[PDB]
Amino acid sequence: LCLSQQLRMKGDYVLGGLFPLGEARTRPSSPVCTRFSSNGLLWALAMKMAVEEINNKSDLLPGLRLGYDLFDTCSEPVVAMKPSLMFLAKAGSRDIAAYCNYTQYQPRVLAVIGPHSSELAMVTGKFFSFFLMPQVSYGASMELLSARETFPSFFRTVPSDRVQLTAAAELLQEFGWNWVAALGSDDEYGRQGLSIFSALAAARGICIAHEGLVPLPKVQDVLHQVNQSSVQVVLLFASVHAAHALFNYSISSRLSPKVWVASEAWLTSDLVMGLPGMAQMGTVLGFLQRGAQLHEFPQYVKTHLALATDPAFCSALQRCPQCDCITLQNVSAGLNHHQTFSVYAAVYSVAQALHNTLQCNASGCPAQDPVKPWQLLENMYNLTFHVGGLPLRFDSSGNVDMEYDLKLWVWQGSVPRLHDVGRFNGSLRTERLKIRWHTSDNQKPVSRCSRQCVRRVKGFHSCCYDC
């Protein structure tokens, strides 16, 4: 199919690429992943489309060709460490020096489009921060990546977990539920979410009745503890598997209805959405991202896959050997994926930062020595770049800012569907006159603790009082 030959393209300023193209040792050998993944290939095609259309553009990066070196990294970081080291090696050589600091390096890649997985993103960011390589990531959302003390050169295009956790805390505060129970997955994602939410609650006056962890497929004990307190609101900041397992077990035990606050991980997932009997467990109030999508991306994918089969094109023109023996049906499912826009916007952001750094104007680019990767960081913070006509900005802490949509599960014929009941844009606004609750009548569930009264302190952080 000669798709792998297109994973590398020369140019004046090549870019990096770390994608989950493939999935799954007594010797120091890099493991090879043979199984093929459609999501990684779709994201790689998205970045390739972004770079090619940027080269097509005249007023952006005029007279310069933008390259890319797409690399297959499995979910493991051991396989992904080698592409980063190959990134930081000097152009034309396979050796990376270990100098005193970053100023003595001349890396072959201007920037890096970081990994989708957040743990891999942490590893690669901690590696690149020593060389001050500007790395922008798609899909990495865990919060501690925003610490500019230890990640001076890590950006992203998806909102961090702090945004959705602050939205959930504002929802809890506005509706008046100041007696809530918080849960999370045993993985790093849930633990980080819980750690941020405890601080957010303590700042906002709410605090947790019971802060537990639901293990991935124990849960019985966690449900018992949650049931012990008279708490009608439960924030389940968990991955899909943990949320599905908890809901299945609670169905088996016939748990009473509660108001579940959902993270983006399982708010829209069809594994829990299609779980039979889920309708008898209260309204699910979650926050969902409000972002655009690459309208022409499916057309690009289909035309590119049709053209790559032509032997003449391949003659005219490995990282992913499994990527060769594929068909359009093996990637047709994930065509309408949100992360494709995230990758497209990340590539556009790096291109705009490069255009600003060279101080190019519409007619052309002034001639000078190549710009070093660390010189981008000045113009990457506080940068405004237009993606598809929609402006975006990088925060001083390196996270993009975007709105959120507050959705709830409206049950109809055992097929729940989402509905707009609020919009978070830094200050939550809700329309509670159209929310259908789960109680006997359409009345808001009450989960409130008295902070003043005879008193007996109750709560995980000792906030309330059992007057």
């Binding site: 040792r25 007594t26 010797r27 120091p28 050998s29 890099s30 493991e76 970081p77 051991v78 460490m81 080698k82 080291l85 190959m86 090696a89 396979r94 050796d95 990376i96 020096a97 270990a98 100098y99 005193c100 600091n101 970053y102 590893v123 901690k126 590696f127 921060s129 020593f130 001050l132 501690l144 500019r148 003390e149 230890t150 001076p152 050169s153 633990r191 750690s195 405890s198 601080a199 009745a209 019971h210 802060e211 962890l213 004990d221 503890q225 012990q228 307190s229 660390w374 960081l377 000045e378 007996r456 302190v457 109750k458 709560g459 995980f460 952080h461 000792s462 059992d466």
Partner: protein, 469 residues
């Protein structure tokens, strides 16, 4: 200098010589931070181990064991040292698909002293399978060898620390405790682990509060002042009198000053391994009125001639104030014995014995063959010897069965600043040999921390809380 000793085989050493005790274009070198005496003491321990190894004609005869000690900050700089260890003598690191035939500058590395930098170093070295023996790293995340094939250890994990805490808690019959964690990952993981372990042994937690990050010798924001005031007020209001603190040794100064100001007295503070042996914190001497302090740390083993050895004595590899800073701590360090120093000693001796077996020499000339790092890693799992009348061998998960110990801080400059009261044996997970403890109570009676006098209807979530009927 003392950061470099040439020899046939090198031995990388990562130590925390400085800490952040108070613009991304410029990188502040670790030499500008305040000097940490503990890191210099541990480096001196490693150097003493190497020199004693070189002296002996029985262990590694005819091979000079050299080392390239470099300064690693607690978090700040933990990438350049690894890049420098992995490079050749020309400071160039080749990139290739296979590293079987690659020989690096150092044959093994004595890892950093905290979990996060240890994780970073292991993630970087997993490609090369360079053996890395960390000391005083307690994270349970390093136990598994799927993602850390080349990581070993010489201290019991956090599981044994939490077990020792719970066993001490049950021995004196306290079932009502207050847990404090720090905002960093280590405190959060340790607090969660303690909660999970203690929830099944009929001991309840009154509440858990998180101390804000507050490095000493700095002007802290009034928001942090209010947070600390609130935390101490909650500590005083609560009826629990056993406070377990899981935080790095640097961020406790402001908290303890606040507690001292509020005049909160009568609690049995239980320390984690982070500050259970902190000499600069123990030097405050105004915490004697806060109650009794305990802490969990490695069993003391007297290393002969280490105190006299300490007294006689590229980039990010030189510190000058360390000597004049550690001179003032000579007496307390000498009297406190050797707890983590023995961990470093054992790590170096384990590497030496692995190299001795790999070279296959016995009391005579060695074969002096080329040694790849992965071969040394393969031969290091099987080390087994008696070091200072202790047994050193590695579990299937890369841990050494070293006894823990609960120490009670007693303030007497003429005696041991960290008196030992109980010994914990990780092999059977049993805490025994509890000795006399100098309590803070009026008649030296055991402090009582129970939320309910023995009688039965329950009140509140916690099972141990009820009202007698």
């Amino acid at each position: 200098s003392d950061f470099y000793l040439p020899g046939d085989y090198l031995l990388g050493g990562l130590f925390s010589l400085h800490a952040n005790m108070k613009n991304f274009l410029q990188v502040p070198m670790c030499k500008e931070y305040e000097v940490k005496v503990i890191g210099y003491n541990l480096m001196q321990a490693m150097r003493f181990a190497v020199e004693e190894i070189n002296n002996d004609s029985s262990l590694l005869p005819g091979v000079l064991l050299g080392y390239e000690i470099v300064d690693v900050c607690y978090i700040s700089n933990n990438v350049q040292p690894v890049l420098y260890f992995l490079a050749h003598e020309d400071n160039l690191l080749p990139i290739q698909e296979d590293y079987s035939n690659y020989i690096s500058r150092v044959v093994a590395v004595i890892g950093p002293d905290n979990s996060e930098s240890v994780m970073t170093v292991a993630n970087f070295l997993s490609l090369f399978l360079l053996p890395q023996i960390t000391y005083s790293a307690i994270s349970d995340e390093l136990r598994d060898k799927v993602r850390f094939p080349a990581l070993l250890r010489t201290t019991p994990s956090a599981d044994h620390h939490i077990e020792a805490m719970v066993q001490l808690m049950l021995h004196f019959r306290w079932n009502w405790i207050i847990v404090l964690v720090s905002s960093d990952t280590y405190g959060r993981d340790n607090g969660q682990l303690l909660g999970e372990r203690v929830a099944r042994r009929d001991i309840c937690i009154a509440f858990q509060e998180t101390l804000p990050t507050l490095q000493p010798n700095q002007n802290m924001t009034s928001e942090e002042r209010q947070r600390l005031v609130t935390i101490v007020d909650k500590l005083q209001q609560s009826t629990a009198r056993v406070v377990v603190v899981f935080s790095p040794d640097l961020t406790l100064y402001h908290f303890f000053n606040e507690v001292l100001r509020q005049n909160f007295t009568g609690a049995v503070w239980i320390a984690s391994e982070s500050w259970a042996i902190d000499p600069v914190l123990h030097n405050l001497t105004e915490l004697r009125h806060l109650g009794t302090f305990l802490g969990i740390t490695i069993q003391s083993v007297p290393i002969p001639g280490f105190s006299e050895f300490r007294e006689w004595g590229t980039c990010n590899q030189e510190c000058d104030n360390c000597l004049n800073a550690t001179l003032s701590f000579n007496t307390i360090l000498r009297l406190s014995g050797e707890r983590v120093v023995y961990s470093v000693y054992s790590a170096v001796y384990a590497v030496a014995h692995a190299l001795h077996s790999l070279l296959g020499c016995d009391k005579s000339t060695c074969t002096k063959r080329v040694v790849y790092p992965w071969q040394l890693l393969e031969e290091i799992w099987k080390v087994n010897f008696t070091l200072l009348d202790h047994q050193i061998f590695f579990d299937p998960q890369g841990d050494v069965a070293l006894h823990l110990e609960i120490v009670q801080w007693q303030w007497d400059r003429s005696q041991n600043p960290f008196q030992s009261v109980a010994s914990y044996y990780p092999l059977q997970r049993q805490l025994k040999n509890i000795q006399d403890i100098s309590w803070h109570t009026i008649n030296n009676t055991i402090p009582m921390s129970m939320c309910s006098k023995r009688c039965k209807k329950p009140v509140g979530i916690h099972v141990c809380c009820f009202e007698c009927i």
